[PDB]
């Protein structure tokens, strides 16, 4: 694999240009901690933070209790989130500064991000529907999925 992705645009967003508190975080996802931070910026340093500390894929439970606990995202919020990204942590990141760029949970179009429909063209034979998933995603995502749906 090369060092570079085109899809490092959808990671690169500057969170300065965000407005916060994002309108589309509301208390039904967010805790009263997150509403504390002063900004976009100062949510993202910190869920970076709690991310790089060491998780085995044990201590599922540990994350989301440490994202609920350090960076006010609720619980089963951040266990959908994780589901949805295959459990790739590395797209966590992305995923926020996503729905708070267009507001929209969750964003539709970004790769890593596996939405309901995106899951519906995987279980499908519908080859037009694929095509634009594998597109998307890429064959390794799809591949990883396909495994998730397995159990």
């Known amino acids: 694999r090369s060092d570079f992705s085109n899809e490092d645009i959808y990671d690169n967003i500057d969170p300065d240009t965000i407005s916060f ?5 509301t208390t039904d996802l967010f805790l009263p901690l997150f509403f504390h931070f002063g900004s976009t910026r100062q949510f993202m340093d910190k869920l970076h933070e ?9 201590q599922a439970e540990k994350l989301v209790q440490d994202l609920c606990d350090e960076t006010g995202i609720r619980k089963n919020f951040s266990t959908s989130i994780l589901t949805c990204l295959s459990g790739d942590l590395m797209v966590f ?33 519908d080859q037009e529907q694929i095509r634009k998933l594998v597109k998307k995603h890429g064959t390794g995502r799809m591949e990883m999925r396909k495994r998730f749906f397995e159990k």
């Open 50 to 58: 709690v991310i790089s500390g060491d998780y085995e894929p044990s």
């Open 21 to 25: 508190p994002p309108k589309i975080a």
């Open 93 to 125: 990141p992305r995923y926020f500064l996503n729905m708070f760029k267009d507001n929209v949970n969750p964003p539709p179009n970004v790769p890593g991000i596996w939405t309901h429909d995106d899951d519906e063209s995987l279980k499908s034979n």
